[PDB]
Design a protein around this ligand. Sequence first.
Ligand code: VO4
Length: 574
Amino acid sequence: VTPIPLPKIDEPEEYNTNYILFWNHVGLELNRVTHTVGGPLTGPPLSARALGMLHLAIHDAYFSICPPTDFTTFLSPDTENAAYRLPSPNGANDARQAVAGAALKMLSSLYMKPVEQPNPNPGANISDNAYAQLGLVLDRSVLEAPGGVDRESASFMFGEDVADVFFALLNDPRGASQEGYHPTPGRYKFDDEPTHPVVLIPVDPNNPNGPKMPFRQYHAPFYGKTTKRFATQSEHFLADPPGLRSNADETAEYDDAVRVAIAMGGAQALNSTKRSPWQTAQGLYWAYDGSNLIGTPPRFYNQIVRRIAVTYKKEEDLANSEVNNADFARLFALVDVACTDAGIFSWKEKWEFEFWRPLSGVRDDGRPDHGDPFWLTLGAPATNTNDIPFKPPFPAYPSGHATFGGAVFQMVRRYYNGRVGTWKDDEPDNIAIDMMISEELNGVNRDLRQPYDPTAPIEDQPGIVRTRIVRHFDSAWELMFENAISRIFLGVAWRFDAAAARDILIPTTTKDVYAVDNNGATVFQNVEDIRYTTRGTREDEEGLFPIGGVPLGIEIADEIFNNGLKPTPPEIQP
Ligand code: VO4
């Protein structure tokens, strides 16, 4: 089959001389390729789960052979419960081959055709071409692996065993099932996107030019409540969103939220849009909304973490350093597990409340002086395609991006505290990075004038090229903040989907109403002053709970970290 020409990644090629980074890279390649061909594990929550599984297998394969001192493996060889019993090396002492076996096994089990019956129903929707393209990636990775891959080594085979255990334990074949789900229309209720109410999909994935059929997609409505958590030691909840349940009386907040939504997230040319060109850039920068050759958010977070990892490594040698190998193996397991669980809980809460997206909220508001029945958002960028901006096929509260970011960056903060600088775990850090480029704005990717051609490199395809923007950030606190507000700029998130409006916006004399500048644009607090303290109530539970994605993510990362990356007790699994 003709291999898809993938655009070059903006990252020093030296990174991939390290085998932990290399295998992470392979996972990221599969992420973007599966989103280009429509293969398995697409979408935000499941793509995160795949990386968590990959790094958990790598983590245990490496630390079994090269025992850690300050912590232990995720699973142990002395577990009485077979499902949680980690294989023993028994002579295997080649960590490089152990990691290779684990990585190759896990990725193969995850992305290759589920010949073992699972092909029916679950996988019965992915074309053979999709599997073919994914296989190419895996195949050449074996050939590109630093130091080579010796499939005959005992160490390699051991790694495979490790992967088998994690796969059988954590894989959720029916994770993205939507069978039986249907929206419950009403005020504040999620329903089909007015801009993309239905889509025509081919009856046969293997014949994309043959007959189509109307399809209404709902992204993983049961995943969050039914799936097996990775390392969380409890269930996490958020305050009821403004307008619902115990907070149904929070009308001033909601009304002002509608106001901020129109001004900050509308289409570029609308007269009501007050968002600045720089804010528009911040919005697209963090997108990674499952586009061709780009993938989902977890991919970008890992790209950023890769830079942080190399920028703050203890030893200069990327290739031959056990200090670096252990550091990277540990960091990525923590980060990707935090990301996986953040995906589980953001999705659990998303479908729990089924809060509508700003587009529907503004349009269907119903009040002549509040809504705009013809409003349009900047929307999720339809990169490397000729389709128009959409909005993620799932509820708004909390923001998936915000939760993912909260988890990933709080983990990075907990991990590097006292090493890169010193800070209170709930206050701004100094983990700066520069030369950070998003593939949404890299001077290569673009908005095509015609349908994407997978046999030609993106550069040879007519379209409007995305401006290349090279960024520098002063801290993971900033990354966390900007990743969250980018969704407000795209018009896909309400302000409270990110965090409590009181913690991120500039207040006025009127309660629940926030400051705007001379030209109407919403004013945000300085990153250094932001503290996620404001909590709210839940109708179904006593106590105060976090508001928005960022606080939820922070909470998840702290818990996992504080427990040293320990499996979720099976007793508390769904
Ligand atoms: O994925 V989002 O909920 O941030 O649109």
